[PDB]
Nucleic acid binder design. Structure first.
Ligand SMILES: [Zn+2]
Length: 129
DNA sequence: ACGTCAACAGTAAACTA
DNA sequence: TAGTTTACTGTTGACGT
């Protein structure tokens, strides 16, 4: 809880610095669905999860026995949880719930695409056991 | 109204400094 | 070492039948 809230607060300030370091400078009210997805793609550089391409032999193998030049991405579970924290952080800082940019349909569709593509590429299942 | 899903909450690990 | 945060887990509330 306390670690979760500080994690949420840090993500909210990280998203704030992201908007200020955006070029052109991006305001919160102008954070369209495309811009939120642009933010989620920007975070792939900090991911640690190997997502194999369809030409790599290790596609669908969660524990390859050799390195490959396939890119590292944010896992679906990281993005799913981050969206939950940012959804709350937006409303905890006075944002109207029905204007929540992290609740836009484009966010839901993107997370589903990441879930289905990574499950095939990684060979893992994101369903709750 | 169970059966699932959505909407966040919460924990674990290992990498960075 | 200790802090961070990606990655994985958990669950109340809401949805769907
Ligand atoms: Zn690969």
């Amino acid at each position: 809880s306390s670690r979760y809230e500080n994690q949420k607060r840090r993500d909210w300030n990280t998203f704030g610095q992201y908007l200020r370091n955006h070029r052109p400078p991006l305001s919160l009210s102008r954070c369209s669905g495309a811009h939120v997805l642009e933010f989620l793609r920007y975070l792939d550089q900090f991911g640690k999860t190997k997502v194999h391409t369809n030409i790599c032999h290790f596609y669908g193998h969660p524990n390859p026995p050799a390195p490959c030049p396939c890119p590292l991405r944010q896992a679906w579970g990281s993005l799913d949880a981050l969206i939950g924290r940012l959804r709350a952080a937006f409303e905890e800082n006075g944002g109207k719930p029905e204007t929540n940019p992290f609740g836009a349909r484009a966010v839901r569709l993107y997370l589903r695409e990441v879930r289905d593509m990574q499950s095939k590429a990684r060979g893992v299942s994101y369903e709750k056991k």
